[PDB]
Amino acid sequence: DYYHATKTTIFNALLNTIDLSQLAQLDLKQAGEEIRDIVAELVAIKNVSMSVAEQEHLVQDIINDVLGYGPLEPLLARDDIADIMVNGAHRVFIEVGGKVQLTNVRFRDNLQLMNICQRIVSQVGRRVDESSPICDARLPDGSRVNVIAPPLALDGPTLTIRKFKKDKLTMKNLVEFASISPEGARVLGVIGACRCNLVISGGTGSGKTTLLNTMTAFIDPTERVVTCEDAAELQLQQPHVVRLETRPPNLEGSGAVTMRDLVKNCLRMRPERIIVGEVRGPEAFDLLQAMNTGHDGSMGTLHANSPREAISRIESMITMGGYGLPSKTIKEMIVGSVDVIIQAARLRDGSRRITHITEVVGLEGDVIVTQDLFVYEITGEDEHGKVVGKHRSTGIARPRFWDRARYYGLERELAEALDAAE
Amino acid sequence: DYYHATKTTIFNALLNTIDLSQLAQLDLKQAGEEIRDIVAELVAIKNVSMSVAEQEHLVQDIINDVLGYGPLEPLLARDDIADIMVNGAHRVFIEVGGKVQLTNVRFRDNLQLMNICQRIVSQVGRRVDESSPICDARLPDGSRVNVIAPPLALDGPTLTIRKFKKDKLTMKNLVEFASISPEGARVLGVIGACRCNLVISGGTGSGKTTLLNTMTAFIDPTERVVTCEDAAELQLQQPHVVRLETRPPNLEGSGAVTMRDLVKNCLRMRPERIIVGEVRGPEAFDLLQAMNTGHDGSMGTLHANSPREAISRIESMITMGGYGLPSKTIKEMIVGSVDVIIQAARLRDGSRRITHITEVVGLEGDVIVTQDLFVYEITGEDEHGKVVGKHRSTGIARPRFWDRARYYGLERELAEALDAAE
């Protein structure tokens, strides 16, 4: 059909007629109306017109290209779409029905794709270009975006969009999915109930956010909780929860409110527990204060592949925080602050499981000595490729946080769970 | 004689006839239709004695020079011409039958050659100039292009086309060169398929990268593959491959993005498989996580003479990563990640062969226990000094990856190849 060729010719004529700079002062609807006027002018110049509905569709396509997210607009609007992948202007894939598929959709040129990516990542004030060719960002519409610039992506800019889904699991789901043994369920319930400084470290795809939500589920209703998170991922059912969200900087590089500022404030809001959506910067240091300067029971999500790795991440983050903290001082602070680390990882089969429940015991020389309470042991692969394994307790009768369990009257529960966990 | 002068005059007239925008916007056929008429009118005005076929040839040459690839185009269209090498406007070489021969065809001047180079690299959206004197690209057709600007090339641009040599390095190439016995070839075909993690270790000059490219050919087309390389060399026929590259820092020591960052981001890019051109530093850690966290079937080359040395090198690379992992944790990670190792070596005679195909069996105490599926036993030498050897199957009929082949149904082929090798 000539619809594609005619649309391309009309787009070229519009480009030769006006420039995007003339529409940067208009809103989405005002820009669309101005583009419709420009399209009428271009049709008059070229004396080419067609069906009114088809002309309106072409005008909408032109608006999307000029101001929207390009040919991605018809795709993002869909719901059966799981993920969108772009490997250059000439190829795009979509995850439908849980499987990848190549679509006929296409871009015009790599520069157009780069501009679209710049728009998408600037929606949250971030910029991807030759200076910072690698970018990861969050679409507050409920998705995650990755972009690589041409200097790294040899075949032009590469883009990936991953959409949301309301997982919102509960501990029953984890128990039934074998992510944690029922004895582990009791142990974790005790740990959460009795205000134990807790860090939920996990690898990519481990769903550590869901684990954090189900952990917070145990918090006593009477405790005033203030949650800091870069998005609204968490959803607590307590009656006295304060929900805060960081504000990404505008394009002018102003108005930013980073995790560090939110945690610093929360220190001054009289919270019974400070809960961080994800530790990703210097805020860790401030968070650690919240774990020891009273406020016992604070939690925090972290990206790491193992408890020792997570401790290393925390130490490195505090170090890069700009403070001249002596190395041993950071280790002492971590040892005195954290009371438990929970490791969540995705095994080769793709299932999420709580590999480690560990408690920081102390500091020896310059190494943080920790003892594992629960560990997941793998034993083989089944017929359908599923990983086979079981949770076993190290048998430690009295973990370091035992005192807190005594204070909250949970000695019996903790002892039972630890003993029967074998 | 007079044909050249008439063509030059017609080219000048066409260049002065209309702005470059009109030619650029017009389609190749659309522009050529008017260009032929313009050339015919110019010839008639000049009243140059020429034939209708000669007129068509002149029109085609004018189109090629003005908007095409100039005198280089006829070489491109040919099939026998595998590689083309222009050492400035006055020297053109072609690789035919594996031999390099100079050809009389030469460009008008270095300026025309630079223009043609820019046009060629524009297809992929890349642009070369005195500010970016070096350019490399892989055109959609699959032919590679390397271009250098005059400020570096002290005798004019150095265009280099390398057309797609399909089936150049497929497994048949290794088998017929005695780099691997046919049974080893079948086993490798099963191993690349079946999505088994690999680490292609090899000594100096063992052709690790060539073997890796051969292995990747077994990937299922639908699998989304991401390749990280220090320098872009790999080329995968698979239709859904994403290519990356590490950017070194400026001389000031800033702006670098090393392999670690690319591998980390690969986890965010939702890849079915991740391929690392060469593992040398901390990235060995991150890569293993990809091998361990559901991105099975990943691959990565390594510099080691024997599988045991390869595993020792992986341990050292992880340890130098700066993370405070204990030795047992690193060994457990390795044994859980790398299913199979291939040790390729350059023998004393200079031949290249796959010395070992081994499978990481387990971890006992503090030692990684491995078994060799295939071993190249040396037996002597010929009067020419060539080394003689045979690929021997160790007789391990059930490698621990056997169950995965059962999942993919390759159990029959695996057992047959293992038993028939002797």
Q: Establish whether B165 is an annotated binding residue.
A: yes
Give the method of determination: cryo-EM
Q: Is B210 annotated as a binding residue?
A: yes
Cβ–Cβ below 8 Å for A367 and B324: yes
Q: Edge-to-edge strand order for the sheet containing A143-148?
A: A99-102, A92-96, A83-86, A158-163, A143-148, A134-139
Residue A158 DSSP one-character state? E
Q: Is B124 on the interface with A (CB under 8 A)?
A: yes
A306 burial (CB, 10 Å; 0-12 / 13-18 / 19+) is buried
- In whole angstroms, give the CA distance from residue B53 to residue B291: 63
Q: Which one of A85, A109, A131 has the shortest CB-CB distance to B125?
A: A109
Q: Where are the beta strands (DSSP E) in A311-386?
A: 340-346, 352-364, 367-381
Cα dihedral A267→A271→A277→A278 (10° resolution): 40
Structure-block tokens of residue B388:
């003689």
Residue A60 sits at the chain B interface (C-beta within 8 Å): no
* C-beta atoms of A102 and B240 within 8 A: yes
| Interchain CB contacts (distance < 8 Å): A and B | 110
Helices marked H in B217-358? 259-268, 283-292, 307-319, 327-337
Resolution (A): 3.4
Backbone CA torsion sign across A57, A63, A65, A69 = negative
Question: DSSP secondary structure string, A31-99?
Answer: HHHHHHHHHHHHHHHHT----HHHHHHHHHHHHHHHTS-GGGHHHHT-SS--EEEESSTT-EEEEETTE
Residue B207 CB partners (closer than 8 Å, separation 6+): B344, B346, B352
CB within 8 Å: B244 and A154: yes
Cβ separation of A85 and B403 shorter than 8 Å? no
Rounded to whole angstroms, the Cα distance separating B358 from B393 reads: 11
A388 touches chain B (CB under 8 A): no
CA distance A162 to A418: 39
Give the side-chain half-sphere CA count within 13 A for B200. Answer: 27
Distance CA A316, CA B112 (A): 55
CB contact under 8 A, A154 and B138: yes
Which value, in Å, is the radius of gyration of the alpha carbons in chain B? 27
Q: In degrees to the nearest 10, what's the CA dihedral of A198, A354, A230, A120?
A: 160
A131 at B interface, C-beta within 8 A = yes
- Judge contact between B121 and B129, C-beta under 8 A: no
Q: How many residues does chain A have?
A: 422
Residue B328 CA to residue B161 CA, distance in Å, equals 50
Q: Which chain A positions have a beta carbon within 8 Å of B362's beta carbon?
A: none
Q: Do A309 and B322 touch (CB under 8 A)?
A: no
**Is B289 at the interface with chain A, CB within 8 A?**
yes
In terms of DSSP bridges, do strands A134-139 and A99-102 run parallel, antiparallel, or are they unpaired?
Answer: unpaired
CA–CA min distance B389, chain A (Å): 37
Strands B340-346 and B299-303: unpaired
Q: Do B125 and A160 touch (CB under 8 A)?
A: no
Residues of B in contact with A278 (CB under 8 A): none
> Who among B126, B224, B324 is closest to A85 (CB)?
B224
Q: Which of A310, A300, A343, A313 is nearest to A202 (CA)?
A: A343
Across the interface, whether the CB atoms of B224 and A308 are under 8 A apart is answered no
∠ Cα A134 A137 A141 (to 5°): 150
State whether residue B25 sits within 8 Å of chain A by CB.
yes
Neighbours of B59 (CB within 10 A): 20
Q: Identify whether the C-beta of residue A154 lies closer than 8 Å to the C-beta of residue B232.
A: yes
Query: Which are the contacts of A368, defined by CB distance < 8 A and separation ≥ 6?
Result: A311, A331, A334, A335, A360, A362
H-helix or E-strand containing B232? none
Is there a binding annotation on residue B313? no
Residue B132 φ then ψ, to 5°: -130, 70
Q: How far apart are CA A404 and CA A406, in angstroms?
A: 5
The secondary element (H helix, E strand) that includes residue A164 is none
Calculate the dihedral angle through the C-alpha atoms of B42, B43, B46, B48, rounding to the nearest 10 degrees.
170
Contact yes or no for B18/B67 (Cβ under 8 A): no
Interface of B with A in 328-367 (CB under 8 A): 329, 336
Alpha helices (H) in B269-408, listed in sequence order: 283-292, 307-319, 327-337, 402-408
Which tokens sit at B195? 């999505």
Is A308's CB within 8 Å of B293's CB? no
Burial of B391 (0-12, 13-18, 19+ CB in 10 A): buried
Residues A191, A401: Cα–Cα separation, whole Å: 8
B179 is in an annotated binding site: yes
Are B268 and A160 in contact (CB < 8 Å)? Answer: yes
With an 8 Å Cβ cutoff, are A348 and B293 in contact?
A: yes
Strand stretches in B87-216, DSSP E: 92-96, 99-103, 134-138, 144-148, 160-162, 198-202
Report the distance separating Cα B318 and Cα B334, nearest Å: 10
List, in order, residues 6 or more apart from A385 with CB less than 8 Å away.
A349, B404, B407
Is B176 annotated as contributing to ligand binding? Answer: no
CA distance A4 to A44: 20
Taking a C-beta distance cutoff of 8 angstroms, is the pair A298, A266 a contact? no
Distance from CA of A221 to the nearest CA of B (A): 36
Exposed, middle or buried, B19 (CB in 10 Å: 0-12/13-18/19+)? Answer: exposed
φ and ψ at residue B204, rounded to 5 degrees: -70, 130
Residue B154 DSSP label:
B
Distance from CA of B16 to the nearest CA of A (A): 22
